[PDB]
Amino acid sequence: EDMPVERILEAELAVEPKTETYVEANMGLNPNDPVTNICQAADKQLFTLVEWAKRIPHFSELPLDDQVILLRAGWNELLIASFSHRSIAVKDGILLATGLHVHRNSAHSAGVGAIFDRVLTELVSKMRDMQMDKTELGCLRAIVLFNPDSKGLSNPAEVEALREKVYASLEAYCKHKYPEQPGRFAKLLLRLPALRSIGLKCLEHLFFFKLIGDTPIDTFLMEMLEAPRHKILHRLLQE
Amino acid sequence: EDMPVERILEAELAVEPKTETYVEANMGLPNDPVTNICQAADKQLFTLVEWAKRIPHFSELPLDDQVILLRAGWNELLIASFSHRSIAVKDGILLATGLHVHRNSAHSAGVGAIFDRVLTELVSKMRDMQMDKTELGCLRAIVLFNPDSKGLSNPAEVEALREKVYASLEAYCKHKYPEQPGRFAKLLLRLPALRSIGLKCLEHLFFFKLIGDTPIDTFLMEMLEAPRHKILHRLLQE
Amino acid sequence: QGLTEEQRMMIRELMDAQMKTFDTTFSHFKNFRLPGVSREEAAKWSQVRKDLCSLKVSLQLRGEDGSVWNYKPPADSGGKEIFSLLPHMADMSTYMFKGIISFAKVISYFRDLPIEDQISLLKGAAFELCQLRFNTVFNAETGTWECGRLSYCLEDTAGGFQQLLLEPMLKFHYMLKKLQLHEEEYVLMQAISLFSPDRPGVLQHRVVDQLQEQFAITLKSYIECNRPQPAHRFLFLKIMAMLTELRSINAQHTQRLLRIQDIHPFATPLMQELFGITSLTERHKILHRLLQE
Amino acid sequence: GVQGLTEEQRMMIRELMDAQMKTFDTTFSHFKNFRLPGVSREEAAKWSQVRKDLCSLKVSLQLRGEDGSVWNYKPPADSGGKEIFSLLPHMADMSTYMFKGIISFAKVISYFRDLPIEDQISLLKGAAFELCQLRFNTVFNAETGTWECGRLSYCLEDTAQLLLEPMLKFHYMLKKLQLHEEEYVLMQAISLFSPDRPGVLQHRVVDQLQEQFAITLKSYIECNRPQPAHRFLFLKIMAMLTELRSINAQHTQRLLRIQDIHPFATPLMQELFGISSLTERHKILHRLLQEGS
């Protein structure tokens, strides 16, 4: 009632379009530089992520630098889960929000094989098997977003509160919408440490490719891999 | 001028008589003396209290300050006094009971080493430097006025009084003995020698008191027991 | 209470494995060593210093009599000193891990799981488990790990306000001990963490997956039942936060350990195995030995 | 404070000073490889006495590393026996280091090595402990109550004023005197050349030596440092040399009691306290007193 689970869904649908019909009809069952492309989707989706966050209730009435802290801390996993949930539409690889479809050859020959396969077996293959609904996705992310254990928050006792309201709302929804699946709400949250462990192995790759320097990294993605000055994020949140 | 070196001599003379004429004329050049020594000790303890009362300002100290001083000092104050009497005789030591003890009656009584120690460390040195009596009453007034004794109401008064004795003995020892320039020091040099002997004496008194086969009188017994002291506490207010 | 028999009989199997392999007093911890009586190689040391700096502790060690020994570590400088608390730490590890490879080894589900995946599973949860156990002996008020006779107290930058929270490894323990969990809740986090499906190398992924799920609902409902209702409502969420933060703390630790080992080979062959320092049953020779006799 | 004594009095002071510095390391740098504490009745009144000796005589031991580490030790309070002989094998090693630093202090004294060997032994036996305490008072601190002995730092344990213990009261009273180092070495000569000690054959020689040192000391204070509020200082020092023999006596009875129950004394220590010529009986002292290597 204060964090309407429907308001969360509106946010997800506003920043993520439908599964494309080519993907629906052909992708499923029954070389341009993978990494550059992956970092290009990352930068692209970072602008999207700010727009998504502003639609998630009460986020935008936080102190401005709290929103920065929350977003900077969780942007990594908010984007990994979002792309993992798109990829359940396809059979085998990952679908970036640029439309690009990556394989376990384009990933193995790129050195990102292990993380690639991990995301397949742990996020995609499990979001698919339990058929992860978008409202659940939008709530898990709101949870990942509202992390009060992040350093510098003016009032973690609201980010805590707002995380609690998502928790209560997602719990009510998960009960309502899936009674036949009783432990479903706790199987979603179980993906969080799986997300984190995968989320950090990606920064562990993003930094390794940032250091080699032979991987183009756009402005917003650069700002995220850079210790706080942040011009872009801080600007967007006021608009 | 506030601790007159003559008032100290008055005290020593008032409690110690002249050397006996038999001793002066013939002396110089049994089956347990230990009882007799103890007997002499108890006798001298009454003398010691009358002595200290004549020493200036000692009687104006807090009543229990006088007790603490006399109690901490009695053992060496008696050893000083009997070591000084014994320079009159040729050998051994002379107790205030007149009894002359030898290092055969001392060796066969167990108190050999300590007795010979008093001889060669106290008697043999008070003699060779010709220790006069005024210096005795001053050294004893120093041993008495020990401010490093537990319980003193005002340790800096006992401190001040030992200083006034130190000052007066200093002035005297210069006046009376100019040709002997370091006399005042070798006097004080006897103090640690007196302590090391004194503590060896209690180490004997307590050993014979333990055996029980050594008669010990009231005051000597009142000195060897822990704080209590009623005799001592009574004598001072008289 | 308010559980299924299978659920309550799985907590019982953990609490069993716990006390059977977790000596709260560390009595059999013995013979452990103590701190006795380029431009790139500099950037390495520069970072290695920043690891151990926020992690400085006194080593209050008690003897049977009541004699208390106490080791106050040096202050930050160059050269090899924090390395000194390190062979002590290395030996504390070999005792902690041994009691971890026995916690798992005596768990029935873990027994049934094939060796190679048992090996894989431990390697991912090894460090994650030690902290879960060490939090059982942590005191937030005094900031020490009361490991029986041995204590590890937190040094004070400006003791007025710590902000040792700036070190995630510490903040975890303060965040965790704040929740005030029961022994069942603690041992349930240990199995959720031990039976994590995303550990590198796990072959029979489905079994471990469904297992972690089982331990999850069990922990979810222990809190719904045993703890009061509009009071401990947002627990499990808080516990889940900790299990997530554990993946970071494990992440931090491993890269940390790698760097220190690189400039100072100090790893027990056990440490090497658990943290992969230079077929899977053949590669892990000694971890192989500890399981199956 | 202008100075001026006889040439003889001047050479004898510096004879001690360049014997003191020659044999006393104020940092105890060469003191290592020593032992350290672990990381049937009605006669037992004898045991009650031993515990009474030590229960006023408590110290916090502390070792500094060259780094910045502080391996601090605090003493166990008493409820039984054997816990009390904690630092005892350590102190036994300390003294063995102090005493040969004492033996050598005298070994280089010209007057001392002129005395026959069977007289050097006798002088050392009765002065060993005396000499130790005066050396330790140099390194003693008042407003902390600790003997800062280089890397070692024996502190103090408040209970209630353990000035009820004369041993402690000595070090406190001797320290408020603020003695010059020239005075400390004269108290040592005075203590070392005391003719009353059991065994002194050459009594007249040693007696004369003491008096010389004594007047030299008084004259030092008299015409050096004589801020005329510095009278009575020879008296205060004399009162301390006197108290040093109560302390010597009472701690010899102490040592005897302890060794009686628990034997720990080093073959040196036994010779220095009695635990037929002397050289046959004090063969380790005999060897240390003929030694030139």
Ligand SMILES: CCOP(=O)(OCC)C(=Cc1cc(C(C)(C)C)c(O)c(C(C)(C)C)c1)P(=O)(OCC)OCC
């Ligand atoms: C991070 C510091 O915290 P801590 O003192 O306390 C946390 C409980 C500690 C954690 C720890 C453990 C290891 C081992 C186990 C692999 C040896 C490390 O190599 C490191 C560093 C940081 C040096 C890389 C830290 P503890 O677990 O040491 C155990 C061996 O602490 C307990 C004494």
Ligand SMILES: CCOP(=O)(OCC)C(=Cc1cc(C(C)(C)C)c(O)c(C(C)(C)C)c1)P(=O)(OCC)OCC
């Ligand atoms: C560091 C300075 O202290 P310190 O040298 O002088 C006394 C202040 C001292 C040393 C010491 C040494 C010995 C040995 C070496 C002969 C065994 C003793 O037998 C004794 C006692 C007093 C027990 C008889 C004391 P501390 O350990 O004595 C024990 C009480 O002093 C600590 C208060």
